[PDB]
Design a protein around this nucleic acid. Structure first.
Lengths: 50, 77
RNA sequence: GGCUACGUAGCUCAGUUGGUUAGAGCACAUCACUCAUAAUGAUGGGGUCACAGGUUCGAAUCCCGUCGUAGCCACCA
RNA sequence: UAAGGUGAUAUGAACCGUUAUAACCGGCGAUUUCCGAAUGGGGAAACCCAGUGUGUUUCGACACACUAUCAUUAACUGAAUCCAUAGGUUAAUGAGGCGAACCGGGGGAACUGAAACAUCUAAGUACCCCGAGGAAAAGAAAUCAACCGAGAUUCCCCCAG
RNA sequence: AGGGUGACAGCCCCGUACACAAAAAUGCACAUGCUGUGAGCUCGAUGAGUAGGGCGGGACACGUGGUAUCCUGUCUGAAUA
RNA sequence: UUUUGUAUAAUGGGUCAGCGACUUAUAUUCUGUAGCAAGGUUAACCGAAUAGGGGAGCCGAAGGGAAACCGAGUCUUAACUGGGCGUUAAGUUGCAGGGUAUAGACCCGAAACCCGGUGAUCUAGCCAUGGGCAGGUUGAAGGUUGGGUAACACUAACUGGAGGACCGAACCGACUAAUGUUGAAAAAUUAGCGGAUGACUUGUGGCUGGGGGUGAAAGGCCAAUCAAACCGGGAGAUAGCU
RNA sequence: GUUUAUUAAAAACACAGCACUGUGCAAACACGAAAGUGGACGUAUACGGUGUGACGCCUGCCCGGUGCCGGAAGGUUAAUU
RNA sequence: UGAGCCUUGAUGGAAGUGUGGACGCCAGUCUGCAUGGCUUUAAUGUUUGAUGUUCUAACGUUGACCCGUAAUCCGGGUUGCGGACAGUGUCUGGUGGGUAGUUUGACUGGGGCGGUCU
RNA sequence: GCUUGACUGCGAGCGUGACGGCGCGAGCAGGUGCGAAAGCAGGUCAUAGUGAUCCGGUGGUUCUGAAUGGAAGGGCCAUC
């Protein structure tokens, strides 16, 4: 569960980095709260074009 | 029923075995939980009775796919 | 059989990294006192550091073999 | 097809027929009360009671038809919440129950054997359950072989107690 | 062949061998019509919470045994010609 | 029949008739017999179907050694004067029979264990809704009025009508006896006995299910069955016993 | 008052009274793979469990054993890593 | 705040004012603090437990209100409470006659008790 | 006094057991001790002093090695 960010956020906030977050942190808060999204190897290209 | 809506995991029967190998019937049943999942693609939460792994699948494949299944298969949800 | 620990004054005991020179408590012993008893005080007798091999110039102080010893593990055709 | 017929116990009555509408046999139709999956609601099975539609030169009350549930699809409707969903009505389809074995699947004994008994056996048997077909299942090598080669699955005889 | 007939029937009866028959409905084959379905060539693609592993069981003749192999309740988790 | 031994007063049989217990399959070995013979024979399957085909295969012709391996020898050991097992006699396939193996394996018989069902129309308890208790006693709290207290206390009458209260029918029980014991009755009859406004008794209907129910507790009751109900099944359980 | 329906009605069971003990309520506890239900539409003057058994006078000593309650030290100790 | 290795601790311009520690058998008026021609006495980076706060936001709610809905079931919704606990799955040590299957020898001047068993 | 014959491989022939087994044994081969030598010694004056198989440990062993080389595992010898 690496995911890519969206806004700032915690000790990793950056509007679009590849972090390595804990899954529960990921698929219970950030994504449902729209602060990140999974890095599904398709996603590692849209925020790897900027 | 204790069936994982994602994997179809259900209880399975096996044995106990003592140090003397006495067999006593028993069941392994799955690590169910039931969990509010955000879809966004429907602006709603859906509670699936899900196994861990069921979760780990949803993590990987991603919800909507999994939801294509279930619906593809007829699961209520 | 494997892992721990521990047994040194007659009873009871710490001392515990050395290099110390063998205690404390009652027990034995005799003198001091006193009306005399016990309360007391003092000097000594008694340790053979669980038994034995070694590292060390100097092991109760570390290494090892058996005992005694209880803890539980754990093994047996 | 036909000279004889109206099932049997079962006579009798009254009939029917003989050259083709007597009976009898076969194909396809028609009718097909009530209960039963029972399906309009109920219920002590073969009964009680309805809503709505129809129906009457005697247009009341009764008779008949339809109204279960689930699924899929559509249509129309439509909360908390505006959107949107859930919810609700209708409609079209299909399901439901029964049935000998064979078949696949979910569960799954003990007696017994070991000259006792735990491992082991009986045995994935008996039994319960779900499902399907005329057969079921299996099947087109991430298989064997042993440096030579074979070439899906299934069944039979060997290999071999 | 067989059954029957007042006792045992090739020639009494019903059959049997053999040869024939379908107005209708049907099983099965083909042949087509209608519906639904896709064929063909070029260039591609090649089955990840999977394989494997840890724990627990179950299957393989095989009782964990030096035990390959298969299945998975549980926690994990690749390479990709 | 069983026994050391049975007229035995030890078993079994009232009598007759019919039925009633060593089977079947597949393996293996021996005997007989048949075929062929250092060879014998095919299995499935094909089939002109008891033929014919099919020799996959099985048995035998070589043994010894755990084995590699060697071979009329081989193993043992450094090695045998040796020693062990072998070298000399024929096998094999049918058919009949004697044994054995696997099966219910000569027939009948358990007490039980497991599985799925059917039972609270008896009884236990509980739930709901209805019914019953002739007649006669006892006289609790309380009340009233006099007496009595400073007022209460207390006291006498009268009134009142308490109780798992009293005597006693219906009703509910079941202490004694006799009768009955192939009964009138698979628990009663007769004479006595207990309770009888209560933890009473009763009609209807409901709920609880088998290692489970229910139990004012006896292992009681759960349909004349109870230290684990009944019906069907595993099932021909097993029976070193009769 | 109850009991062995059908050889035991009693000194047995029950009983009010007594004591210990559990239970803070989504109670303990019981039926139940679970949902749930009883406990109770109750709430510590309540409820379960256990022993004792109206009343009167009373209920002495022993915590070594077994059990239960308390005990944030230390010794030994599972999967795991 | 428990505990290792890395780290903030120590070892196999002369001379003046001169003071704790040194495995130091058994305690150096000697060295530095401003100045003078490969550890216990404890603490910064970690891999790791215990407790307490905070975060997000799972999860519980047999509190309240709203809708489905004239409904003490369920669901959805809002909210308060609880909150990474509780609970559950797999694994695992303890306890476990609550429940189950079984064992509990033979000889023997009956059996038991005794004795015996090579 | 000196010593390791309480030796390794074998074993004609016997005894004794239902059997598993146990016992006695001259002699052969290799190597050894004591004795000048003939010789004697394969434990003790003899008869008790003991435990089948399975499972497993250890040492040895080119005997086996699931395609092949190895290895695991097995066998054999010794022993627990």
């Amino acid at each position: 569960m690496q995911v890519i960010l969206l806004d700032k956020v915690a000790n990793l906030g950056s509007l679009g980095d590849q972090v390595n977050v804990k899954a529960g942190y990921a698929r219970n808060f950030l994504v449902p709260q729209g602060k990140a999204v999974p890095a599904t190897k398709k996603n590692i290209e849209f925020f790897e074009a900027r | 029923s204790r069936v994982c809506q994602v994997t179809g995991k259900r209880p399975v029967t096996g044995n106990n075995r003592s140090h003397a190998l006495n067999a006593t019937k028993r069941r392994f049943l799955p690590n169910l939980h039931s969990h509010r999942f955000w879809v966004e693609s429907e602006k709603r939460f859906v509670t699936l009775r899900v196994s861990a792994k069921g979760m780990r699948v949803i993590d990987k494949k991603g919800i909507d796919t999994v939801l294509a299944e279930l619906r593809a298969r007829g699961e209520k949800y």
